[PDB]
């Protein structure tokens, strides 16, 4: 019988494997598994005797064989696996007696199976649900012995009747047939913990009509519920689950949530699938409560307890979700919250501070020009620190949590040469905060900031036309600047008033009651994605034309447009650049504004009839 | 201040122990807080003696 030695190893591995919570897992000393007396199973010429012997005589060894012991003319040919548990009856025995014997013997067979379940499955190798259930089913065996003794005293007086005996054993037969069904099912391969907790709901429904097997199955389930519910306390009311094994609810890793904690989906009972993410998210949240110091306890904490029809015990999980998720949130709405944190990120990355970067460009021109690999980050951090201080940008407290970082790619992530291609900022992460405001997500956020900085940087380039011509008679350069500025400022008003603030407020208002951290993460994703989409270029055609537009303009606005080669302070090579830039620009301008037509700003770019055809 | 109240509850335990009352530390702790509101102590004794009879009668 190697099965009792192989399944044993699998089921304790299935408790040592995922978790080492609780040290040095025990195993029972070997001698328990191998004596025949720790199993509920084990001289006259009988056929010549009159019936006044026979009936009374056979109930003797039957009454022995009702218990796990040998008979005297009834017998048991040996077990070798063989879970039907056959019984041997003698020749020269009356066949009218024999059929009633065969009516009774299935008691002895199912009994031997029950008690073989007892010796084996009560061990450390099979999980706390099997421990408390094995206690429950070792209960009734003594009542069977009591019955046996109550029959034995009648037998000793010799008053006993086969028909009375048969009549009496009926609730016993029924009762241990109930157990044998659960036991033999758990004996089908395995039932670890929650996989059993199919049966412990489902078998009570399967017996709901019988009205004796029903309350029996309530008892068996009332026993088995307690240890599983007793560890359940430690993720519903506490920061870490004290599973002494690995047999309930959560896989977990040592390192985001998809790593930290994941449901063990058949180690959830017949009842709790719709509660499983409630529990798992709550446990995750309580881990944060603990992670942060905080307070790891619970005022709704009381025993989770089984009931079949009036199944209102599952609302304890809802009451706990509305305590424990909620108390984590009540932290995350006055510290590690979205509020002053997102005000700083809005101030710099979404450039709500429009008085910050005037300093940065008034300072960093020594950076904004030098060839490749000359990157100097302490100088950049000092430029940030000064451009902060001299401005009003100075005033917010998270400016010191802020940093200068570097980006390698000039928007070509879509599918030194300092600053213009390479700026980045970072409001630094904390691991408690990394469940919401986090670097891996702030990558997408830095792409929006690159665009908002770059577009206003080429606005500084275009604005250099104004200061570099205002001899003083020519206006073709300034109406060319007008044709560009009528676009680039009025994309920027859109990119700044419409792309962010509506979308941002769409998230912001939710923060007052947003159900849970994954909901907040969904809002944050949708917000950042919607803005991302509310930006001009973020299309599969990519509106790549805009880069060319801004390119030919930067050659105009800074690289040629310098006091008309100081003439005011006439060989037509000045005007030939305006003509060639106009020839590129006017056509690329047409395609871009046409695309802005076929894909609300365009309506105000036409308005009174501002060209309409370029 | 406060630990004077715990040791008060040690006096008011042990004397209730030698006066062989049926009481326990939860009921003692609340019965002093009822007495601090001025509630009649013989009236409290009348509810306590009858509630232990019903507590058994539920079996």
């Amino acid at each position: 019988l190697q099965q009792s030695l192989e399944l044993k190893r699998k089921m304790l591995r299935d408790k040592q494997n995922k978790k080492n919570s609780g040290q040095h897992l025990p195993i029972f000393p070997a001698w328990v598994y191998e004596r025949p007396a720790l199993i509920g199973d084990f001289a006259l010429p009988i056929g010549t005797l009159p019936l006044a012997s026979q009936e009374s005589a056979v109930v003797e060894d039957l009454l022995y064989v009702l218990v796990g012991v040998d008979g005297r003319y009834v017998s048991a040919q040996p077990l070798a696996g063989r879970q039907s548990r056959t019984f041997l009856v003698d020749p020269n025995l009356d066949l009218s007696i024999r059929e009633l014997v065969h009516r009774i013997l299935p008691v002895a067979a199912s009994y031997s199976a029950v008690t073989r379940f007892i010796e084996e499955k009560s061990s450390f190798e099979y999980g706390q649900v099997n421990h408390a259930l094995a206690a429950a089913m070792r209960t009734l065996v003594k009542e069977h012995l009591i019955l046996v003794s109550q029959l034995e005293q009648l037998h000793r007086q010799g008053l006993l009747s086969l028909q009375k005996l048969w009549f009496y054993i009926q609730p016993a037969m029924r009762t241990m047939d109930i157990l044998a069904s659960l036991a033999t099912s758990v004996d089908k391969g395995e039932c670890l913990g929650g996989s059993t907790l199919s049966l412990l709901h489902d078998r009570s429904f399967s017996y709901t009509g019988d009205s004796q097997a029903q309350e029996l199955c309530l008892y068996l389930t009332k026993a088995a519920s307690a240890p599983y519910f007793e560890v359940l306390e430690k993720w519903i009311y506490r920061g870490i689950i004290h599973d002494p094994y690995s047999e309930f609810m959560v896989e977990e890793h040592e390192l985001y949530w998809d790593q930290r904690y994941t449901i063990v989906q058949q180690q959830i009972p017949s009842f709790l699938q719709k509660m499983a993410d409630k529990i798992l998210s709550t446990g995750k949240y309580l881990n944060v409560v603990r992670e942060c110091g905080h307070d790891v306890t619970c005022p709704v904490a009381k025993e989770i307890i089984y009931t079949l029809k009036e199944r209102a015990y599952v609302e304890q999980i809802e009451k706990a979700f509305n305590y424990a998720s909620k108390v984590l949130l009540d932290f995350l709405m006055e510290e590690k919250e979205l509020v002053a944190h997102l005000r700083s990120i809005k101030r710099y990355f979404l450039m709500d501070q429009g008085d910050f970067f005037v300093h940065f460009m008034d300072l960093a021109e020594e950076e904004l020009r030098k060839p490749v690999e000359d990157i100097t980050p302490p100088r950049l951090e000092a430029l940030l620190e000064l451009a902060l201080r001299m401005s009003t940008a100075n005033t917010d407290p998270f400016k010191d949590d802020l940093k200068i970082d570097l980006m390698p790619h000039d928007l070509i992530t879509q599918l030194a040469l300092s600053g213009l291609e390479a700026f980045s900022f970072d409001y630094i992460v904390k691991w408690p905060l990394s469940l919401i405001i986090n670097r891996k997500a702030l990558t997408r956020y830095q792409m929006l900031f690159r665009h908002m900085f770059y577009c206003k940087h080429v606005e500084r380039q275009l604005c250099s036309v104004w200061i570099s011509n205002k001899a003083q008679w020519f206006a073709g350069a300034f109406t060319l600047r007008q044709r560009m500025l009528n676009f680039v400022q009025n994309i920027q008003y859109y990119m700044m008033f419409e792309v962010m603030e509506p979308t941002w407020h769409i998230l912001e208002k939710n923060l007052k009651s947003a159900s849970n951290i994954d909901d907040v993460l969904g809002h944050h994703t949708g917000f950042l994605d919607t803005c991302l989409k509310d930006c001009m270029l973020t299309n599969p055609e990519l509106l790549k034309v805009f880069s060319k537009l801004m390119s030919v303009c930067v050659m105009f606005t800074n690289c040629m447009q310098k006091f008309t080669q100081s003439m005011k302070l006439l060989v037509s090579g000045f005007e030939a650049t305006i003509n060639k830039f106009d020839k590129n620009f006017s056509a690329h301008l047409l395609d871009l504004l046409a695309r802005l037509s076929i894909y609300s700003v365009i309506s105000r770019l036409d308005f009174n009839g501002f060209y309409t055809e370029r | 201040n406060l630990n004077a109240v715990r040791e008060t509850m040690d006096v008011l335990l042990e004397i209730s122990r030698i006066l062989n009352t049926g009481l326990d530390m939860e009921t003692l702790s609340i019965c002093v807080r009822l007495c601090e509101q001025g509630i009649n102590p013989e009236a409290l004794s009348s509810v306590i003696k009858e509630l232990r009879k019903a507590t058994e009668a539920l079996k």
Partner: protein, 147 residues
């Protein structure tokens, strides 16, 4: 607090596990008793009455403990009135005790002999309890056989 103290006192009196509406029934029993009574000799004297009839039964130092353990509350009269009016209700060793061979300056006395039949009745108690306990076990498992 006021009404909430009657609420959970009823829960303390209710036994450990139909754990549902009996919790209201018991509250009505409490209110009934409370208000049928309300509409119809200080504490130190009260306890001396109990001090005395302890001190006559035996158990004199316990009686001494009682009065010394509550002369200390001069720096709770209504609280004491609970314990005395509930006093009967409850549920039904030393070597230095009464031993002349130890301690320092023990004075002359000569044979007590009652302090020996005392000691001899204690040992009779510790055999008799464990005989009545053996009677209460043997009847238990034999009854379910005979029934």
């Amino acid at each position: 607090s006021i009404t909430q103290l009657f609420d959970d006192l009823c829960e303390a009196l209710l036994p450990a596990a139909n754990r549902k509406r009996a919790k209201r029934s018991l509250k009505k029993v409490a209110y009934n008793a409370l208000f049928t009574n309300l509409f119809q000799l200080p504490a130190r004297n009260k306890i001396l009455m109990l001090s005395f009839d302890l001190r006559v039964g035996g158990l004199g130092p316990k009686a001494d403990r009682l009065e010394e353990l509550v002369e200390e509350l001069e720096a709770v009269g209504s609280v004491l009135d609970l314990l005395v009016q509930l006093a009967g209700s409850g549920p039904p060793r030393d070597y230095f005790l009464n031993n002349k061979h130890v301690g320092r300056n023990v004075p002359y006395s000569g044979y007590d002999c009652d302090d020996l039949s005392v000691f001899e009745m204690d040992v009779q108690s510790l055999i008799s309890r464990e005989e009545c306990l053996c009677h209460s076990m043997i009847q238990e498992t034999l009854q379910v056989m005979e029934a």
